[PDB]
């Protein structure tokens, strides 16, 4: 167990996204996107771990078509992301992203966000884009009751996280307070913007 870097799970070159991510998202969107609490409700832990163990052996994405509780997939996705050796936004850009979201001027904040994203290795930008597009849909389904702020409170610890492997108790509590605002900005970027990274080639 343990997982490696994000890039260690990409096979296709365009866009550079892990199959595991692609499949979870497709399934979640497949089931309609109308279940209350998507990503807020935990799937069955035993199930999430068993699906994960199959996968991590040689990176064989299992069929999710028959997993009935859709939350177990939401959980399986976040679990995959949250356990990479380095967060989706990478260690190197952790602060950058945080301070670009704290810029009180909306525009300049939006501008520094574009700059930071463009800094990420391609795999993370593509994978991140895919996710922002996915979540913007989730946030747009009334039934989910999961608005941008909710998603931001649940995904912030996952794709933003920390600037180091093991933060100390204080610095940790600090990052957590800052993560949400970062996810908010990312979600506020136009779909057009995110979509350009989705073209094959």
């Amino acid at each position: 167990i343990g997982e490696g870097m994000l890039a260690d799970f990409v096979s296709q070159t365009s866009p550079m996204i892990p199959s595991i991510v692609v499949h979870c998202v497709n399934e979640i969107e497949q089931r309609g996107l109308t279940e209350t609490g998507l990503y807020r409700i935990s799937g069955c832990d035993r199930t999430v771990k068993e699906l994960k163990e199959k996968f991590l052996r040689v990176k064989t994405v299992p069929l999710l078509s028959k997993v009935d509780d859709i939350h177990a997939i939401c959980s399986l996705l976040k679990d995959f992301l949250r356990n990479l050796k380095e967060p989706l936004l990478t260690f190197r850009l952790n602060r950058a992203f945080m301070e670009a979201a704290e810029i009180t001027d909306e525009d300049n904040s939006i501008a520094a966000m574009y700059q930071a994203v463009g800094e990420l290795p391609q795999a993370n930008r593509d994978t991140l884009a895919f996710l922002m597009i996915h979540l913007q849909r989730v946030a747009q389904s009334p039934h989910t009751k999961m608005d941008v702020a909710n998603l931001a409170k649940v995904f912030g610890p996952t794709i933003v996280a920390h600037a180091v492997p093991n933060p100390d108790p204080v610095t940790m509590s600090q990052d957590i307070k800052r993560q949400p605002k970062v996810v908010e900005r990312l979600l506020s970027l136009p779909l057009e913007y995110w979509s350009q990274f989705m073209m094959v080639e």
Binding site: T36, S42, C44, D45, D68, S75, K78, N150, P157, T158
Partner: protein, 191 residues
């Protein structure tokens, strides 16, 4: 002064926050928002004595697994909550929550708390469960897990109707006091 630290843990959306608010304010929260971390308080009068009950709310999402342990230190009792109408949340009690607190607080008591019992008669709810060929958790099933996992007691309630709400906390108060060994022997400690 004698303060009682109670930390509530459990899957997201089971109703941790709702029971803390309904109890302390007699008002049921309408909003649908995830809890990062919070802590309320109340002075209770049991045995004719003034007791301060420090309540600690936490995030059930696995995403907060590293930040949650920060509220454990000095805990006198844990309320491990699951929704009686969410079989998976009941499942994660033995597969995750009990393992977690006993790994951080080996000496701290904890009560199994079944929440949202009023939903056992919700037309929509029951049908969504059967749709997946599932059913709600019965008091008897929970009481068994309670014993198996060495919980002090099993209690359930509806934060909506407050049915069994006050009682949950009463038992949670007794669990931290009633024992013969000093209150200290049950208080959690870091590392």
């Amino acid at each position: 002064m004698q303060t009682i630290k109670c930390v509530v843990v459990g899957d997201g959306a089971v109703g941790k926050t709702c029971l803390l608010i309904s109890y302390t304010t007699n008002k049921f929260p309408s909003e649908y928002v995830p809890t990062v971390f919070d802590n309320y308080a109340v002075t209770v009068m049991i045995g004719g004595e003034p007791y301060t009950l420090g309540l600690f709310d936490t995030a059930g999402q696995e995403d907060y697994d590293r930040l949650r342990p920060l509220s454990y230190p000095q805990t006198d009792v844990f309320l491990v909550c699951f929704s009686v109408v969410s079989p998976s949340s009941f499942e994660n009690v033995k597969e995750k929550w009990v393992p977690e607190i006993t790994h951080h607080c080996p000496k701290t008591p904890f009560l199994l708390v079944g929440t949202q019992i009023d939903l056992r008669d919700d037309p929509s709810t029951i049908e969504k469960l059967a749709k997946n060929k599932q059913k709600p958790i019965t008091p008897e099933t929970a009481e068994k897990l309670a014993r198996d996992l060495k919980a002090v007691k099993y209690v359930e309630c509806s934060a909506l109707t407050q049915k069994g709400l006050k009682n949950v906390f009463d038992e949670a108060i007794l669990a931290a006091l009633e024992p013969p060994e000093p209150k200290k022997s049950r208080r959690c400690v870091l590392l």
